[PDB]
Amino acid sequence: XXXMX
Amino acid sequence: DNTPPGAEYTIDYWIKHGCINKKSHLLDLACSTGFSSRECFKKEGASAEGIDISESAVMVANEKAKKLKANNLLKYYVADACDLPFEDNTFTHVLGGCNFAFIQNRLIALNETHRCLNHMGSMCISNFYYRRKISDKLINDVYNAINFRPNPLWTLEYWHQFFSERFTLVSEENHEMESQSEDELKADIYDYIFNRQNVFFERFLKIRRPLNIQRDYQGVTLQIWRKK
Ligand SMILES: [Cl-]
Known part of the structure; x- marks a missing residue:
């Protein structure tokens, strides 16, 4: 869903 | 997942x-x-x-x-x-x-x-929160989509109020999210359903559309709370 590396 | x-x-x-x-x-x-x-x-x-x-x-x-x-x-x-x-x-x-x-x-x-x-x-903690005021319609839409009406007042301040009674905020890192374009969303749904049907696609799209839309008003907060 949410990518933040 | x-x-x-x-x-x-x-x-x-x-x-x-x-x-x-x-x-x-x-x-x-x-x-x-x-x-x-x-x-x-x-x-x-x-x-x-x-x-x-x-x-x-x-x-x-x-x-x-x-x-x-x-x-x-x-x-x-x-x-x-x-x-x-x-x-x-x-x-x-x-x-x-x-x-x-x-x-x-x-x-x-x-x-x-x-x-x-x-x-x-x-x-x-890693919580979703609302950074912007979201209309009732969209909340209702999400509720309809996934039978789980989120609370539009679940802001950072609210969570802080919730946790700060018994805990001390030690660390916080906020990440603001954003919606995908219909094309991108459809591309992802398609890719997933076809590389990992039409009915499935339509249902998925139907469900995900409002969720996607909702993202422009949301953020994710990473927090460390210390017991007090
Ligand atoms: Cl309770």
Whole structure:
């Protein structure tokens, strides 16, 4: 869903 | 998937700012298949006890622990966050993730986690929150889509109010999300359904559209809360 590396 | 928002990034954040090390003993709250604690173990060697309402999930978590040759350090049980089967002062950390937004009685649960945490123990959070005012229509749309009406007043301030009664905010990192274009969304849905039908596609789109739209008003907050 949410990518933040 | 069964992971917290941000996945490995979140775990890393928790490990760094929560100071999780090999000496740590974690409570994996609503652990599902045990991703968070298992990752903390793989990364840092920390031990953990996890709880979930799903028996099968717990069994998966245990089996995965076994395959990792770590079932002496990682143990999982069927239980509710509102009634933890652990003694006072058992854990150095609680992995809360986004679960306080979904569990049935979250203050009772919070108090239980507070009870089971050691002195100066840390609560590790990754919550969704609303950064902007969202109309009722969209909330209703989401409710319709996934039978779970979110609270548009679940802002940062609200969570802070919720946690700050029993905890001290030690660290916070906020990540603002944004919607995909219809094309991108459709591309993802298509790719997934066709590379990992039309009916499925239509249903998926129907469900995901409002969720996607909602993202422009949302954010994810990574927080470390210290017991007080
Ligand atoms: Cl409650």
